[PDB]
Assembly symmetry: none
Amino acid sequence: SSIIRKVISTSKAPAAIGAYSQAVLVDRTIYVSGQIGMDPSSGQLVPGGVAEEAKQALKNLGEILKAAGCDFTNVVKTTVLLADINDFGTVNEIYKTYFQGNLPARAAYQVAALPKGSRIEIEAIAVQGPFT
Amino acid sequence: SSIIRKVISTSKAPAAIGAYSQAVLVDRTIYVSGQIGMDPSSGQLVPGGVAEEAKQALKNLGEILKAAGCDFTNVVKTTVLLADINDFGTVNEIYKTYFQGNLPARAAYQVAALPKGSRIEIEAIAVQGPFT
């Protein structure tokens, strides 16, 4: 009856730049904030556009999961928000190398704009787990 | 021969997690627990990364000193623990806005992780009473 609720926080990923936690762990589900390709040390976007931003965002997601005792195998659902729908193939290809087994559910669509003029934001939900 | 020993406790700096005291005054020396950039009111790490955190950790240290009848001039030694040694330049400048005149001794290095996913933790030793 009292379930674990924890603010996940790790200096391996970018500081929060607004009123949000990097992720929240509640019972065994982790809700992860929308990850953009900010460099962890400096907080600004990595340069280079969508491919580099996607890689940094996924690395940032990894480190946040690591701080919640998980890794990319724990992800059950992601949302890929794109500044340009035509980047979807490139991003899928990047995305494949992080997620390589039981793939999360996924939604993906182009938005009108992302924070900081980013080209990609990735949301995720993960579940902690001895899974059967 | 029976010396002063006092637990320092203030509402305006992060309350002490179960065990440990915010600071312990013994004779005239104050051992201050490590401070991070946590808002006393919300209990969260302030947003914005190392510079905001360094400021908030120095403010928390200020309030604990104030409850011991001291201020920043009383600090004789600090240890600056960083999540990234490349932040040293930033924090050194911020730190100069608190510490004027008889500047404390210092030791500074990068550690593998800090409480609450913190990017900077400051440990201080102060001494009370009039000098000279």
